[PDB]
Amino acid sequence: PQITLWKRPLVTIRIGGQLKEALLNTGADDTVLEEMNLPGKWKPKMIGGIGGFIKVRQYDQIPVEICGHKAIGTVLVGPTPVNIIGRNLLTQIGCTLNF
Amino acid sequence: PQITLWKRPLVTIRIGGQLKEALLNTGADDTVLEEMNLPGKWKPKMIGGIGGFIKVRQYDQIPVEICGHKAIGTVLVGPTPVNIIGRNLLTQIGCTLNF
């Protein structure tokens, strides 16, 4: 689909069997979700944003469905203010910026 | 143009007679540029993201050229690790997300 930016680019995603709202964020290298439980082994990591760095849990090879399209990759979980879909998964669904 | 997301979507912008590289960020509501002296009145403002909040200065009706496309809007200035073009200006150049 074509998504204009007059509003936040929010989409529904399906992960771990749950439905969640997420922002298609071209300004994030990674995908970061709010605290939640995901299966598998996780390792501690730190990421940076506009107001500093935070600690997150990294889960590898996690299947995620973004607005229908399928992706499988790294998902970070931690105290982010909103669920974010970053470039690591946006590239998998063939997303581009056009103008 | 069509920009792929394999790498950060950086482009050249023109503001106040200066050329800079800025990240096209569909994940930012506003445009935030790294510290730079801009003439004109401004208002104090706090904006937040991952990690917390930073204090910035808000300037209005600032002409900005994004890859040859003319736009004019609000520009926030503060200690941001990178120059960021947000939705307020992206909508002006008819930028869309497509997949």
Binding site: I47, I84 | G27, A28, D30, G48
Partner: peptide
């Protein structure tokens, strides 16, 4: 209000 979600790794 949280409105700028820039994000990157170290």
């Amino acid at each position: 209000r949280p409105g700028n979600f820039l994000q990157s790794r170290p």
